[PDB]
């Protein structure tokens, strides 16, 4: 199945967001990132994707289709706006083994604040 995500300058949670920011999927699904506003892209964060998954980075303003294979949690960012909180959590399969690790990992405060909301207020 396919899940569409919009990359925006302003959305329900504030400035620079992915909508939705919480994506549930299964091995084999695709996630399509659509740059509704310009200046955005998607990139996997180091140490924040499952063991065995390949890292990825799309070009700015391009539509990007990510195929997810490995189960686990993935924290992705917009390269340009990571420090402004622009992230999404993907979640492949049930009880992703690396979720608690990603929540504990070092990252900007604003990012941590949004992650915590997406896990609570979206689960
Ligand atoms: Cu961005």
**Domain map (residue ranges) of the chain:** 1-123
Known binding positions for Cu cation? 40, 78, 81, 86
Q: Please give the distance, rounded to the nearest whole angstrom, from the Cα atom of residue 80 to the centre of ligand 1.
A: 5
Those residues with Cβ within 8 angstroms of residue 95's Cβ, 6 or more apart along the chain or in another chain = none
Neighbouring C-beta atoms of residue 115, cutoff 10 Å: 21
Known binding positions? 40, 78, 81, 86
d(C-alpha 97, C-alpha 52), whole Å:
13
With DSSP H G I counted as helix, E B as strand and the rest as coil, what are the percentages for the chain, rounded to 5?
Answer: 15, 30, 50
> What is the DSSP code (8-state) at residue 77?
E
Hey, which CATH number is domain 1-123, 2.30.30.90, 2.60.40.420, 3.90.79.10, 3.10.105.10? Answer: 2.60.40.420
Experimental method of this PDB entry: X-ray
Q: Please give the distance, rounded to the nearest whole angstrom, from the Cα atom of residue 71 to the centre of ligand 1.
A: 26
What is the stated resolution of the deposited model, in angstroms?
1.8
Phi, psi angles (nearest 5°) of residue 88 = -140, 150
């Amino acid at each position: 199945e396919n899940i569409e995500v919009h990359m925006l300058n302003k959305g329900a949670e504030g400035a620079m967001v992915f909508e939705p920011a919480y994506i549930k999927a299964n091995p084999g699904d695709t996630v399509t990132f659509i740059p509704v506003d310009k200046g955005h892209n998607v990139e996997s964060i180091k140490d924040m994707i499952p063991e065995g998954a390949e890292k990825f980075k799309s070009k700015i303003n391009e539509n990007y289709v990510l195929t997810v294979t490995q189960p686990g949690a993935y924290l992705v960012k917009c390269t340009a706006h990571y420090a402004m909180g622009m992230i999404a959590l993907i979640a492949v399969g049930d009880s992703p083994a690396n979720l608690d690790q990603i929540v504990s990992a070092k990252k900007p405060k604003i990012v941590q604040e949004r992650l915590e909301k997406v896990i609570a207020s979206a689960k």
